């Protein structure tokens, strides 16, 4: 019945990607799109858009992959080699402004929910705030 919808979205994404798919449709969720917007506003996916599978509103999420490769396993590298939820329903993960993560020595990101919106490992830091460490991509 889906306990944590968000962790799912990531997984749906983490799977569709691992096979190289055009787009994936994660179920409608304002807060979800946020992690999406951010996910794109940071250039991890071509983008997304609302749809409806018979009164069932989902969200097309277009995946971005790399260039074809030379040699065996000519499988194109991916934009997202790793996404994993942090704060889980079975163990909420909160962090203070000084506690925010440093994802992949800076190359990475760390979406998170804050009292004043949904920011990232830099944004939130710049805003100098804190909140539920939603997760981390890179």
């Amino acid at each position: 019945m889906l306990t944590d919808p968000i962790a799912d979205m990531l997984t749906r994404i983490r799977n569709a990607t691992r096979v190289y798919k055009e787009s994936t449709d994660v179920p409608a969720s304002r807060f979800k799109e946020e992690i999406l917007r951010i996910l794109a506003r940071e250039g991890f996916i071509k983008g997304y858009e609302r749809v409806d599978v018979d009164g069932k509103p989902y969200l097309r999420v277009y995946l971005k992959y790399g260039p074809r490769r030379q040699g065996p396993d000519p499988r194109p590298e991916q934009v997202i080699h790793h996404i994993r939820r942090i704060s889980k329903p079975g163990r909420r993960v909160y962090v203070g402004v000084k506690e925010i993560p440093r994802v992949r020595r800076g190359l990475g990101i760390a979406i998170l929910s804050t009292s004043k919106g949904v920011l990232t490992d830099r944004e939130a830091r710049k805003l100098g705030v804190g909140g539920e460490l939603i997760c981390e991509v890179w």
Binding site: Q70, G71, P72, P74, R75
Partner: protein
């Protein structure tokens, strides 16, 4: 000129024993068989020959291979009729990948090709006269098209890839542009320049292989008539 030819009788092949990857190249399933989408075929043919042409004009050798009977003979033709090496018999293992060592035999070929015409034939017992002569029959039986250039190919063209995927592999580990005419019973991905279309009916094979060699020559000078295609072609 193109379309018509193909639309003629050179598309749609293997049925219900496909590969989902190759789902991007296919129009529908008529009475069972998978009817490949020629519309797209064409597009691919382009990029492919583009490459061929962008190579046939820069002094580059190509290696053709086809170890299947319903496509042997022809491949033997189009190759000699272009000076491009090729493989019609048993594609030895480790050719490209163990060239230096396979070559060793090519050298053994001439080793005999020379002792063939010589006064040393006056002697030598019947034991060897048969041994060597035979040792050559086969020797000559496999390298008839794998000699020409004592240097790896800059690429390789092929009929049914999966049928000879082993060659393909070798090619891929050594980084060597892979081009080939594959049908629905094969996986694109590991194929660089994909010519989607029937791999068994010599009808399609001849055509796609034909206009290929010509194109190889159009970039060399000497445009002529086609090669011996019919002799028992249905």
């Amino acid at each position: 000129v193109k379309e018509l030819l193909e639309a003629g009788v050179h598309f749609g092949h293997e049925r219900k024993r496909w590969n989902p990857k190759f789902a991007r190249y296919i129009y529908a399933e008529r009475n069972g068989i998978h009817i490949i989408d020629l519309q797209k075929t064409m597009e691919e043919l382009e990029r492919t020959f583009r490459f061929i042409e962008d190579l046939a004009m820069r002094g580059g050798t190509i290696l053709f291979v086809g170890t299947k009977k319903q496509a042997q003979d022809i491949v033997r033709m189009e190759a000699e009729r272009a000076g491009m090496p090729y493989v019609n018999q048993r594609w030895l293992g480790g050719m490209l990948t163990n060239f230096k060592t396979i070559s060793q035999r090519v050298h053994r070929l001439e080793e005999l090709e020379a002792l063939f015409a010589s006064p040393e034939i006056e002697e030598r017992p019947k034991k060897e006269q048969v041994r060597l002569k035979h040792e050559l029959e086969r020797l000559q039986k496999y390298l008839s098209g794998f000699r020409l250039l004592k240097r790896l190919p800059d690429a390789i063209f092929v009929v049914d890839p999966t049928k000879e995927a082993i060659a393909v592999r070798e090619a891929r580990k050594l980084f060597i542009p892979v081009i080939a005419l594959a049908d629905t019973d094969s996986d694109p991905d590991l194929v660089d320049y994909i010519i989607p279309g029937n791999d068994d009916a010599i009808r399609s094979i001849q055509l796609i292989l034909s206009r290929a060699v010509d194109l190889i020559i159009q970039a060399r000078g000497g445009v002529v008539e086609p090669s011996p295609s019919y002799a028992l072609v249905q």
